[PDB]
Design a protein around this ligand. Structure first.
Ligand SMILES: [Mg+2]
Ligand SMILES: [Mg+2]
Ligand SMILES: [Zn+2]
Ligand SMILES: [Zn+2]
Ligand SMILES: [Zn+2]
Ligand SMILES: [Zn+2]
Lengths: 162, 162
DNA sequence: TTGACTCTCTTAAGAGAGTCA
DNA sequence: TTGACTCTCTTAAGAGAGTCA
């Protein structure tokens, strides 16, 4: 809600509830042929999810609290960042999973960045493979690799140059 | 159904027409601090675009040919790939700009790959910066770099471990 | 047969808000 | 007040199809 105290109280309640989510260990590629381990705090697959939490989509949740007799609601991963600017360079800030695990609500696996920065982590080579993200990746992106391109650049005639 | 010969004729007419589009020289990052040059064949900003071409969205066009009294229509960048498989790994193939210039219709700047592979090129370090795409990038992706993350991973209490 | 418009849809990373009990 | 559902929306890489003359 409006006050900094009220916002801190929301973050604190969220952390306490998410802190009781099951901790699931995931071994992950780091890049450079190395492997690491992440501990994701995973929201349950079905209700009940935790005090204040409800599912609005297959992989979407919201956190809600009643403050000053009014319901305040947020996307479930946005709560750690309620004191941060909600835009950057005219682009909306989004909660971005460094662990690429949507059910995870571990704030140590989240950052707050444009949707383009968020998406791009999917292809990052990872913290031991050349990640240049200033807020460093925790793992190689799941889509990193050579791809599966069916056909490359080509022409039949002689009208084009690269 | 259109025969192989008829499809080749469509591709040839498309190439003839696109080859007469304005050719614009662009200096581009290649990765590794190097600069290169791409020559884009750019569809006009407003009608007329060229024989067979029409705009269906702000940066979307279609190519249309009428063969034996039947109207056939294709997305304007898909025509080079009409003799190729149209899916791979259960994913639809998409025209993918290696030059990242949507108006460009140079077939030497296009490849044919899944939408995920397509998107990922936006963040590629480039052919001189570590590109691992099997069909190599022509330039560093426009969104490559450290990003502009507003807030990184953080907690207020001690409920979490990474 | 052709041009120049019109409309809505897909995907996978993210969102806000309403209906009931 | 809290829980458990419902719906549609945003973005930026990409699509198919209709109307009229
Ligand atoms: Mg993400
Ligand atoms: Mg692209
Ligand atoms: Zn996680
Ligand atoms: Zn990274
Ligand atoms: Zn081009
Ligand atoms: Zn590449």
């Amino acid at each position: 809600a409006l006050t900094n105290a009220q916002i801190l109280a929301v973050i604190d309640s969220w952390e306490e509830t998410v802190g009781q989510f099951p901790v699931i260990t995931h071994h992950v590629p780091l890049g450079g042929g190395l492997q690491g381990t992440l501990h994701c705090y995973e929201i349950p697959l079905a209700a009940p999810y935790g005090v204040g939490f409800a599912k609005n989509g297959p992989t979407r949740w919201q956190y809600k609290r009643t403050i000053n007799q009014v319901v305040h609601r947020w996307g479930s991963h946005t709560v750690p960042f309620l004191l941060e600017p909600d835009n950057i360079n005219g682009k909306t800030c989004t909660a971005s999973h460094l662990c690429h695990n949507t059910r995870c609500h571990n704030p140590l696996h989240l950052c707050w960045e444009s949707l383009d920065d968020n998406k791009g982590r999917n292809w990052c080579p990872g913290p031991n493979g050349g990640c240049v993200h200033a807020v460093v990746c925790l793992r190689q992106g799941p889509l990193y690799g050579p791809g599966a391109t069916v056909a490359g650049p080509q022409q039949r005639g002689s009208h084009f140059v690269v």
